[PDB]
């Protein structure tokens, strides 16, 4: 776990899914999803998509272990939705690292 960087908090974005049922679900469940991401350092990556892919998997993983000690459970609708919001977040974290810092 000492190989990972941890980013500071961010506002979770609103994601749109193509149906009202999913849009309402997301917005009603989104507080259960992460608002910070885990990543590997930038100097290991050639391109943005590879960083985003790892950041996504690392972050989902830690979040699913942290919160099943809590006593949360995730449906598969929740893991798909985390996949989408965490991707966006990993993208923002990449832009923080490379432009803003």
């Amino acid at each position, epitope marked *: 776990l000492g190989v990972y960087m941890l980013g500071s908090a961010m506002s979770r974005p609103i994601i*749109h899914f193509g*149906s*009202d*049922y*999913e*849009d*309402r*679900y997301y917005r*009603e*469940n989104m507080h*259960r999803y992460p608002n910070q991401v885990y990543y590997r350092p930038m100097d290991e990556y050639s391109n943005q998509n590879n960083f985003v892919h790892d950041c996504v998997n690392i972050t989902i993983k830690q979040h699913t272990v942290t919160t099943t000690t809590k006593g*949360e*459970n*995730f*449906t*598969e*609708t929740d893991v798909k939705m985390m996949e989408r919001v965490v991707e966006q977040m990993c993208i923002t974290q990449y832009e923080r690292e490379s432009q803003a810092y």
Partner: antibody
Framework: EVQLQQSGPELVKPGSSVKISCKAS????????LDWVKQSHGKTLEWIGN????????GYNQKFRGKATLTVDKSSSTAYMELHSLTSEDSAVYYC?????????WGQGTLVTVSS | QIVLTQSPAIMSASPGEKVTMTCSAS?????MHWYQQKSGTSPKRWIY???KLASGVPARFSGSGSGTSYSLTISSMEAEDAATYFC?????????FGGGTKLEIKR
């Protein structure tokens, strides 16, 4: 093939409370949403709150906080609405409504009459 | 509390007529839903996600709209369609309904 059965009509005294049930039968959805809606005197519809019965999550209309409490017995697929401290304006027909993407089912409603 | 306003409140139409009723939002919603309720029965979802017909809803119904203006159309009014129609939004808490259009048929 899924159906919602609600409990029967209640006559309650003002000041008391009541609890109504909505049981989902022959259901096979993992994560669906259950809304509760009130109808007063044959017309006006108001949303009270919702529960996702398969893990935890519960929403309220501000106007009904302190008045409704939503819970679920997910062993028997039954969802409950507690109504606290009733008065005459709580006399109404109460509905549970199931939603899962395209699919929607409404219960036949529970008539609550608040009277001495 | 997005307010939904439906007009007209009462409407009469002849068999065969094209009927349109409108639901207007005080702010933008992405999607609108419509319910039918006849006397004695509980509301039933009629159109969802603005233009999709629920199961067992006849083809002569259609929905459209964007932003703050949404409508429900019946291309050919039939006696069975006499009822009250409500719109409803899930854009933000609290989810609200319109006050209904009551549709009657001339005979």
């Amino acid at each position: 093939e899924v159906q919602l059965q609600q409990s029967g009509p209640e006559l309650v005294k003002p000041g008391s409370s009541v609890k109504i049930s909505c049981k989902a039968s022959r259901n096979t959805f993992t994560d669906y949403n259950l809304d509760w809606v009130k109808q007063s005197h044959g017309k006006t519809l108001e949303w009270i709150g919702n529960v996702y019965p398969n893990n935890g999550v519960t929403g309220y209309n501000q106007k009904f906080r302190g008045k409704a409490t939503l819970t679920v017995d997910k062993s028997s697929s039954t969802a409950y609405m507690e109504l606290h401290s009733l008065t005459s304006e709580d006399s109404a027909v109460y509905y549970c409504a199931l939603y899962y993407y395209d699919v929607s089912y409404w219960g036949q409603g529970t008539l609550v009459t608040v009277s001495s | 509390q997005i307010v939904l306003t439906q007009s007209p409140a009462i409407m009469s139409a002849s068999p065969g007529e094209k009927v349109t009723m409108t639901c207007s939002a005080s702010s933008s919603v992405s999607y609108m839903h419509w319910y039918q309720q006849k006397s004695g029965t509980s509301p039933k979802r009629w159109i969802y996600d603005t233009s999709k017909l629920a199961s067992g809803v006849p083809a002569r119904f259609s929905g459209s709209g964007s932003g703050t203006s949404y409508s429900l159309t019946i291309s050919s009014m039939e006696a069975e369609d006499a009822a009250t129609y409500f719109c409803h939004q899930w854009r933000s808490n609290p989810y609200t309904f319109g006050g209904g259009t009551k549709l009657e048929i001339k005979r």
